[PDB]
Design a protein around this ligand. Structure first.
Ligand SMILES: O=P(O)(O)O[C@H]1[C@H](OP(=O)(O)O)[C@H](OP(=O)(O)O)[C@H](OP(=O)(O)O)[C@@H](OP(=O)(O)O)[C@H]1OP(=O)(O)O
Lengths: 496, 359, 564
DNA sequence: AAGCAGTAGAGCATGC
DNA sequence: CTCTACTGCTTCGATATCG
DNA sequence: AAGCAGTAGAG
DNA sequence: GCATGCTCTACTGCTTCGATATCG
């Protein structure tokens, strides 16, 4: 659905064989799984903090589940990520965290994979919210568990069928296992070629820390043709200028919110003043125009909300430098009117022939003055692994008014000699790269995320995000090898 | 529900219940908790209304506590604001002595919100807040009357909002705004009266259309508002009949038009008969000979309906109270009773006494 | 910085008599002049506006010697326009039954600049003339009017009722002139103003003669009156060493209302008696007031609010280290798609206004990017407090100017994935070939760009980037309407607002056939309700008892219908 | 100011 | 008297606030 | 915060 | 003029976004 959260259970095989790693200048698989789980917590605490996470330890002596089963320790329930839930997981880090872990958890115990999948199913059952995906990440290094037995093996395959009936899909994060990881002994039929470490733990250690919003529609309008031919659209947005979250005023001695209340009162008698006994004014030198709070919202209303089509236009008149507002994306909604998708698709694949674009008056909300907007059609681009990059529909391009443009002063046209143009073409060909779409990253926002992480987890000092929007002065210099001095000598006079 | 079950036996515990209600309103966040706190508070003030506990309820402090909320109304949602306006009016109904020097502020707040909710071409009206303001204004107009002789501006504004509230809208569900308008009209039609004479045809047609509705509660409220309308209009005509003859003629010809018709359906016939007997004072001052023809043909009608035409065994006896009240009203303005119809009248009222447990 | 306008208005005899099927031309002059002056009064400008009429039955000008310079009353002088002129344009302007000279209106307006502005220091000097070209002029000041204003640097703009080339609503980009909307004296005066303007300037005075309709939907009345936007100076640095000194000007920026709506109180009408406070309570039982120094700001981190003070906020934060317009690379065109443009503004980056070397360097860069079909990627920061950002600087070669146009580009955080269902690979949404033919007919019937009789020129009907914002042309008229008649409610919208916001009739009335075709071809069933109904539509609905065969004989004897 | 999931009770049909 | 500061003020981006 | 342009300290 | 469910409408909570007022 839409309000459905994403749930995830981290299942770590803290039994016996992740605590004596064979290199000692490398990192034990228990520490690898703990660093991975902690990076997912730090990523999801500001990426999508409405999701639910849990970590369960099996192969451990002491137990803390609800059924009081043998050798299953549930460290945390399914709940939203927090600072204390990362500080509790901090204790089992490094070569010392093993020793901190042994004295209060357990180790090397017998277990049953059926009962650990049972405890994970009970964790998913006890959730009162609605869940979109339910997943179990299995951190294990031994393939073929319960190798001495087959009743345990068949019961485990049965309880995995029980899990996959209800919609829970587990995946294994296999660890090293010197001697390969044979994925076919036990873990090809339980889950939805010898190996080394993985291809998922390493890019799961890459903390992304970028907020992700679900697909809401932002407007559900009716696209009218004259007064009669109305079809229903939704006006989505695909670029939106991520902001930092706003601060919350706290009480300094308690660190609790403080419930701001603003009131208007007159300084004559100090009496509480309602919204009915004020007006709105503007003073122009000596005249005072006095409207009301209702009448100031009447000045703006022109049309009804929706899109009024006003003909069609070739794209050659839609100038690229005519930009004032980030574009939106329209898409037919075939539930407020029937056949909306058919009329949209006919209009789409018929404006896709020529370079024509629908022109509209866009009224998003009620008492909002109209804007002229250009519905440029677009096809879809996809691949054979069904990754689509452009969805089909129109791109709603806002066009400026006469007073949104501004004029420039007079500037002389001082053209260049073709020697200068040809020696600047070499300069621009030397520095060429590929702009993907999402190679760059907001440094102010990233540093805010880093500072908040380091102040809530009270680590040692704020990590600095390595800047990326900055230019590389030495690399650009050595790329442009000994060229810019002769270019500025050839185009610039020998002075200054 | 426990305060409904046990009534004034809650009296040693009521002040702590009031402090708990006020605390839950000011500290809890959900509308689902602020609404029953105000429901319990309103029911508490209605229960321990006439008592000595109304000094222990600091009613004047409760007015400041809930009048500050209208100023910091920073989305108090809708159905909390309904209860807040109803509570503010009920503070003027019960214990009005600690509410004398802030009744005018409260009238200003009620009329400002009613104006914002009905006279706004910017947005859809919030019907909970409309029902709440009309409830609170109907409670404040007890003990703080705003009549058409003392100050006619406030009474004309209140009548205009009531007349907008009770107007029929085709394709209407949610009959809380028309019910609150009709109940304020049924209680206080006496207070706006000069506003009531000149809008008389429209008010009669609206109140007569609302009485044939499907809802029990809206129809009951409309019947009460209609009898209050007819009572006030006849009392206004009976003081000055040298310029209200046309109104008297319209009302009499309307009552006769309902009476002659066989589309009675017993509610319309009962209100025709009741108003027909109600307009007898004005007929006594306008003709002096007409209240004698009334009660002759009204007794002939009572006789033919349920006395000797033995048409019993049907839905015939369920308008006998209305006929009896009408004869009782016409008989007051009649000097020199004929004495030919007196045994018929006596037999009619003892037949009413006989047919008492059938109701 | 300032200017000065003097406004010649036609109050002639034939100026206000003809109302055949259109609006009266003198009142159209009133509409355009009220659109000109209400913007200048409501924008709080420092400009001089003098009203001068011609065709008037009085006269008072500096040199009215003889029959020349007659029938002309300068109504006010170079002075800041108050609301008096605003109300006098509709009240104390009456039409005239008097045909006066029109070329002499220019030469009487050519005195006020050298008389009233005798010691003040101006920058722009403009004469606006609303004429009719219908009176026998005086062709004696021919080279006088032409050498004089070129000697003392005066700008001029003319206005006919009809420019050079579906009922006349007021002009909705349709018929700018009717079947007979010109007299022979109009033709003679039109010819003399065309030749006097081309002989005045050369090739560019022809673009300053606008009809009333087309100027009512355009900003030509402020074209030679708007000021110059300020410069952003920096240095375009392509490497650590190369530095091109640049100036950037905001090309497109969405202009919004600058004057607020001050909250005054009712029944006193003063902003000063009322004062708001924003106290901070606590969430205890009786909410205790706390001061503004017991409050620290805090941020949400998961399921808890962590304290983050403001001095620590300024200490640990990003540091922009000043303004910059560096270059990160030059990718190419068509990697930067148009749908990823991000900011609120458009920058146009020129060189220095004074540097021949920086101009030839910037021109070589622009021409290199134009030749390679490549664009640039920059890191623009405004100053030390602005956030840094990336964007695209693409070439914009012209024949009149040349510059780099910079539009901001998204970050990774600013992108939404949002998969959508396919429409060309759908099954039950594939249109029929007849329905495809029908929408092809509708598209071809509703074009708005018609190639004239020329080679490849595509001048388009209904251009929606030249129309002014209707928001201000409603706000100014309602502010006028309550500064002049302060009791009546808000008026309806003006008709020319809808006329400039609608498409013309030659595309409206043509396409009635395919609209009526697809109305029957595509079945559309809507199943909703209750959309946009206000409280002013819900709760406004108005908009002797003894007499209560021979009776039939009465009915026959007095008055009745058909018998029997 | 609007989308979007979730619910509670208002208003009404129905009962032979 | 002929050259550099103070105020103005004008702007603009980021921030907070509200429907 | 940031900057250019009218009027006042400088021997 | 009563009793019992059933449908579905209208409201709330949460969350995003955009317009407006304000501050370094
Ligand atoms: O002749 P138009 O179709 O009305 O447009 C022209 C011109 O178009 P061309 O490039 O074909 O000559 C410019 O259009 P853009 O550069 O905006 O795309 C425009 O420039 P500005 O709007 O930036 O001012 C302006 O020409 P100019 O710059 O000389 O004013 C304008 O002519 P108008 O000013 O008469 O509208």
């Amino acid at each position: 659905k839409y309000s459905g959260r994403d749930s995830l259970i981290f299942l770590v095989d803290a039994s016996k064989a992740m605590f004596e790693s064979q290199s000692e200048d490398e990192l034990t698989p228990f520490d690898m799984s703990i660093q991975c789980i902690q990076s997912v917590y730090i990523s999801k605490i500001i990426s999508s903090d409405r999701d639910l996470l849990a970590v369960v330890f099996y192969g451990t002596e002491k137990d803390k589940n609800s059924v009081n089963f043998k050798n299953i320790y549930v460290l945390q329930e399914l709940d939203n990520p927090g600072a204390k839930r990362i500080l509790e997981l901090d204790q089992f880090k490094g070569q010392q965290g093993q020793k901190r872990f042994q004295d209060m958890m357990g180790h090397g115990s017998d277990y049953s994979l059926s009962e650990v999948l049972w405890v994970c199913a009970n964790l998913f059952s006890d959730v009162q919210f609605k869940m979109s995906h339910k997943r179990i990440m299995l951190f294990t290094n031994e393939d073929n568990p319960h190798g001495n037995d087959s009743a345990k093996a068949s019961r485990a395959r049965t309880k995995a069928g029980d899990l996959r009936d209800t919609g829970i899909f587990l995946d294994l994060m296999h660890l090293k296992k010197p001697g390969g990881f044979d994925i076919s002994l036990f873990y090809r039929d339980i889950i939805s070629v010898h190996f080394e470490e993985s291809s998922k733990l390493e890019d799961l250690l890459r903390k992304v820390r970028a907020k992700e919003t679900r697909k809401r529609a932002l407007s559900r309008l009716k696209l009218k043709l004259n007064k009669d031919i109305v079809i229903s659209v939704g006006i989505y947005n695909l670029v939106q200028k991520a902001l930092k979250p706003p601060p919350i005023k706290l009480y300094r001695e308690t660190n609790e919110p403080v419930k701001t209340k603003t009131r208007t009162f007159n300084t004559s008698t100090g009496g509480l003043l309602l919204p009915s006994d004020t007006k709105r004014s503007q003073i122009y030198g000596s005249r005072q125009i006095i409207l009301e709070k209702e009448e100031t919202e009447e000045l703006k209303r022109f049309d009804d909300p929706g899109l009024m089509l006003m003909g069609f236009k070739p794209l050659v008149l839609l100038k690229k430098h005519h930009y004032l507002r980030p574009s939106l994306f329209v898409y037919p909604e075939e539930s407020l009117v029937i056949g909306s998708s058919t009329l949209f698709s006919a209009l789409l694949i018929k404006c896709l022939e020529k370079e024509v674009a629908a022109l509209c008056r866009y009224t998003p909300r009620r008492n909002i003055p109209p804007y002229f907007v250009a519905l440029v059609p677009q096809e879809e681009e996809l691949d054979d692994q069904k990754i689509q990059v452009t969805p089909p529909g129109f791109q709603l391009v806002f066009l400026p008014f006469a007073d949104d443009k501004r004029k420039m002063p007079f500037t002389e046209k001082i053209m260049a000699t073709p020697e200068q143009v040809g020696k600047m073409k070499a300069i621009v060909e030397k520095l060429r790269f590929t702009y993907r779409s999402d190679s760059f990253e907001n440094p102010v926002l990233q540093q805010h995320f880093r500072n908040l992480e380091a102040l809530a987890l009270d680590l040692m000092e704020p990590e600095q995000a390595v800047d990326l929007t900055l230019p590389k002065v030495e690399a650009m210099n050595k790329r442009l090898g000994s060229l810019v001095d002769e270019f500025k000598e050839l185009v610039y006079p020998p002075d200054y | 529900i426990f305060l409904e079950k046990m009534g004034q036996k809650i009296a040693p515990y009521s002040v702590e219940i009031k402090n708990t209600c006020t605390s839950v309103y000011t500290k809890d966040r959900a509308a689902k908790c602020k609404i029953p706190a105000l429901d319990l508070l309103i029911k508490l003030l209605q229960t321990f209304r006439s008592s000595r506990l109304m000094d222990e309820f600091k009613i004047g402090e409760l007015f400041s506590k809930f009048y500050g909320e209208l100023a910091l109304k920073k989305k108090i949602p809708d159905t909390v604001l309904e209860k807040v306006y109803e509570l503010l009016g009920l503070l003027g109904e019960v214990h009005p002595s600690e509410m004398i020097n802030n009744a005018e502020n409260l009238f200003r707040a009620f009329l400002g919100e009613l104006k914002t909710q009905m006279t706004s071409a910017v947005r859809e009206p919030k019907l909970p807040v409309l029902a709440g303001c009309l409830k609170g204004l109907s409670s404040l107009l007890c003990n703080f009357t705003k009549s058409m002789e003392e100050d006619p501006q406030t009474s004309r504004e209140i009548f205009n909002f009531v007349l907008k509230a009770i107007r029929p809208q085709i394709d209407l569900k949610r009959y809380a705004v028309p019910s609150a308008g009709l109940r304020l009209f049924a209680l206080h039609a006496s207070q706006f009266s000069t506003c009531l004479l000149d809008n008389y045809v429209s008010l009669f047609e609206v109140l007569l259309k609302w009485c044939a509705h499907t809802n029990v509660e809206l129809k009951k409220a409309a019947l009460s508002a209609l009898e209050s309308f007819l009572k006030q209009v006849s009392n206004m005509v009976a003081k000055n009949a040298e310029m209200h003859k046309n109104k008297l003629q319209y009302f009499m010809e309307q009552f006769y038009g309902i009476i002659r018709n066989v589309d009675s359906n017993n509610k319309e016939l009962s209100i025709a008969i009741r108003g027909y007997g109600l307009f007898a004072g004005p007929c006594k001052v306008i003709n002096a000979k007409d209240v004698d023809f009334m009660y002759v043909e009204l007794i002939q009608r009572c006789k033919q309906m349920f006395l000797t035409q033995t048409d019993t065994g049907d839905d015939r006896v369920y308008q006998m109270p209305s006929f009896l009240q009408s004869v009782a009203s016409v008989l007051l303005y009649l000097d020199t009773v004929p004495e030919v119809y007196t045994p018929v009248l006596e037999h009619l009222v003892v037949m009413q006494i006989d047919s008492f447990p059938q109701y | 910085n300032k200017a000065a306008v003097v406004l010649c208005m036609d109050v002639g005899f034939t100026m206000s008599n003809s109302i055949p099927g259109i609006e009266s031309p003198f009142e159209q002059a009133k509409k355009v002049i009220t659109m000109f002056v209400q913007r200048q009064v409501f924008a709080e400008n420092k400009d001089e506006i003098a009203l001068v009429l011609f065709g008037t039955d009085g006269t008072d000008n500096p040199l009215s010697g003889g029959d020349q310079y007659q029938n002309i009353t300068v109504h006010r002088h170079l002075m800041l326009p108050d609301f008096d002129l605003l109300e006098d344009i509709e009240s104390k302007i009456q039409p005239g039954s008097q045909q006066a000279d029109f070329l002499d209106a220019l030469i009487v307006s050519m005195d006020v600049i050298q008389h009233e502005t005798i010691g003040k220091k101006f920058e722009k000097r403009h004469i606006e003339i609303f004429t009719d070209l219908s009176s026998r002029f005086s062709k004696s000041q021919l080279d006088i009017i032409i050498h004089s204003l070129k000697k003392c640097d005066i700008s001029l703009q003319f206005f006919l009722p009809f420019s050079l080339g579906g009922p006349f609503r007021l002009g909705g980009h349709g018929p700018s002139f009717p079947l007979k909307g010109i007299t022979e004296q109009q033709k003679e005066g039109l010819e003399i103003v065309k030749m006097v303007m081309i002989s005045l300037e050369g090739e560019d005075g022809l673009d300053e003669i606008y009809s009333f309709s087309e100027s009512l939907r355009k900003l030509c009345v402020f074209k030679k009156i708007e000021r110059h936007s300020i410069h952003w100076p920096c240095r375009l640095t392509i490497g650590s060493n190369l530095s091109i000194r640049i100036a950037a000007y905001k090309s497109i920026l969405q202009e919004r209302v600058k004057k607020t709506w001050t909250v005054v109180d009712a029944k006193t009408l003063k902003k000063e008696d009322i004062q708001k406070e924003t106290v901070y309570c606590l969430n205890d039982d009786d909410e205790t007031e706390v001061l503004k120094e017991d409050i620290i700001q805090g941020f949400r981190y998961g399921s808890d609010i962590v304290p983050f003070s403001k001095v620590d906020e300024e200490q640990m934060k990003y540091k922009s280290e000043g303004k910059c317009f560096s270059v990160l690379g030059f990718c190419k065109s068509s990697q930067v798609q148009r749908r990823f443009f991000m900011g609120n503004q458009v920058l146009k980056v020129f060189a220095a206004r004074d540097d021949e070397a920086a101009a030839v360097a910037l021109s070589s860069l622009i021409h290199a990017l134009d030749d390679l079909d490549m664009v640039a990627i920059v890191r623009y920061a405004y100053d030390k407090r602005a956030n840094p950002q990336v964007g695209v600087a693409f070439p914009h070669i012209k024949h009149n100017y040349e510059c780099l146009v910079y539009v901001q580009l998204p970050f990774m955080e600013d992108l939404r994935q949002y998969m959508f269902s396919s429409l060309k690979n759908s099954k039950k949404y594939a249109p029929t070939e007849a329905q495809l033919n029908a929408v092809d007919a509708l598209i071809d019937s509703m074009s708005l760009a018609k190639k004239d009789e020329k080679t490849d020129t595509l001048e388009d009907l209904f251009p929606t980037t030249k129309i002014p914002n209707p928001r201000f042309q409603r706000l100014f008229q309602c502010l006028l309407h309550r500064a002049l008649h302060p009791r009546e409610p808000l008026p309806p919208i003006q008709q020319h607002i809808w006329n400039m916001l609608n498409p013309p009739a030659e595309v409206t009335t043509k396409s009635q056939i395919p609209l009526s075709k697809i109305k029957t071809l595509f079945p559309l069933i809507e199943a909703k309700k209750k959309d946009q109904v206000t409280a002013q539509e819900i709760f406004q609905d108005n908009h002797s008892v003894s007499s209560l065969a021979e009776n039939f004989r009465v009915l026959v004897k007095q008055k009745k219908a058909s018998f029997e």
